[PDB]
Design an enzyme around this catalytic site. Structure first.
Site, PDB file in Angstrom:
ATOM      1  N   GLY A  17       0.845  -1.166  -0.613  1.00  0.00           N
ATOM      2  CA  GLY A  17      -0.069  -0.159   0.607  1.00  0.00           C
ATOM      3  C   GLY A  17       0.679   1.035  -0.031  1.00  0.00           C
ATOM      4  O   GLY A  17       1.611   1.433  -0.764  1.00  0.00           O
ATOM      5  N   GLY A  20       5.059   0.621   2.153  1.00  0.00           N
ATOM      6  CA  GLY A  20       5.719   0.169   0.745  1.00  0.00           C
ATOM      7  C   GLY A  20       5.009  -1.347   0.179  1.00  0.00           C
ATOM      8  O   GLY A  20       4.209  -1.195  -0.025  1.00  0.00           O
ATOM      9  N   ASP A 129      -4.428   4.536  15.171  1.00  0.00           N
ATOM     10  CA  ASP A 129      -5.160   3.945  13.684  1.00  0.00           C
ATOM     11  C   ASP A 129      -5.577   3.113  13.837  1.00  0.00           C
ATOM     12  O   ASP A 129      -5.716   1.525  12.679  1.00  0.00           O
ATOM     13  CB  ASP A 129      -4.255   4.153  12.509  1.00  0.00           C
TER      14      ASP A 129
END
Ligand SMILES: COc1cc(OC)c(NC(=O)Nc2cnc(C#N)cn2)cc1Cl
EC number: 2.7.11.1
Length: 269
Positions: A17, A20, A129
């Site tokens: 994504g 990397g 996140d």
């Protein structure tokens, strides 16, 4: 020294994504499998710092509900991170679109997610996140919090630090991050754990973002749990959702009281 022991072959390309490339590295001698994140510090105002913090925090984390960190290797611009391998895949990949999963399994997963977050928080670190694609699973199906590319410390030397950098994922981000200049790190992480509980129990996301301008978010404040997205959730775990998805971050529930929650401690269900 056993020969060839430092030679992991990159079998598969696990992820691919914004970051990397993540390869599944298997050791040449031992065969120990491992995940390898290939971060690219390019240009001159990007990853050269993006990866140092992710690597600096990983060198602290140590919980069986967090992706274990092995090491790293700085080769010119290519930085390789040695993290745990989770053949379980992504929790995300265990949510039946629009359905969810058996209520018992959600509970288990939610316990381990609480486990790690309590841990993380313990050592003053917020993930920022939390979402199903970051909650990995291994062979025994145990939840692991992964990807600390946005994690930052919110407590150092016993002083909490309010935050103001808006980062994470819209649907999962708490309401205060879009309405308030500064905010407490922890409650933002519980809110996301709450957005995950609903995903795990309904196979769908409550809203695009926690803002009045968003139809469902507003009806949730109306308490329109009727035949709407939460109509798939049982009253027990729904009662808990009422407590986490509280807007006032100061009135929200806290991990400690989540452990004191009824559904959270109800058997098998
Ligand atoms: C194809 O399913 C998969 C997808 C994954 O995501 C990259 C993984 N990854 C892992 O085993 N672990 C990890 C651990 N940390 C990061 C970061 N940052 C990424 N992947 C495994 C499977 Cl089995």
């Amino acid at each position: 020294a056993v020969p060839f022991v430092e030679d992991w072959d990159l079998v598969q390309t696990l992820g691919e994504g914004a970051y990397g490339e993540v390869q599944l590295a298997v050791n040449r001698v031992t065969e120990e499998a491992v995940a390898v994140k290939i971060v690219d510090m390019k240009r001159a105002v990007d990853c050269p710092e993006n990866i140092k913090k992710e690597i600096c925090i990983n060198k602290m984390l140590n919980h069986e509900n967090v992706v274990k960190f092995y090491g790293h290797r700085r080769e010119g611009n290519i930085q390789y991170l040695f993290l745990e391998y989770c053949s379980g895949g992504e929790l995300f990949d265990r949510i039946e679109p629009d359905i969810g999963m058996p209520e018992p399994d959600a509970q288990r997963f939610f316990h381990q997610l609480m486990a790690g977050v309590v841990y993380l928080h313990g050592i003053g670190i917020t993930h920022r996140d939390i979402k199903p694609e970051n909650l990995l699973l291994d062979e025994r199906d145990n939840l692991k919090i992964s990807d600390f590319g946005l994690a930052t410390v919110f407590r150092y030397n016993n002083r909490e630090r309010l935050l103001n950098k808006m980062c994470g994922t819209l649907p999962y981000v708490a309401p205060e991050l879009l309405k308030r200049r500064e905010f407490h790190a922890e409650p933002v992480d519980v809110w996301s754990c709450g957005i995950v509980l609903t995903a795990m129990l309904a196979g769908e996301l409550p809203w695009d973002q926690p803002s009045d301008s968003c139809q469902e978010y507003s009806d949730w404040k109306e308490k329109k749990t009727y035949l709407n997205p939460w109509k798939k959730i049982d009253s027990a775990p729904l009662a808990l959702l009422h407590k986490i998805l509280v807007e006032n971050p100061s009135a929200r529930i806290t991990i400690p009281d989540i452990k004191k929650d009824r559904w959270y401690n109800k058997p098998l269900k």
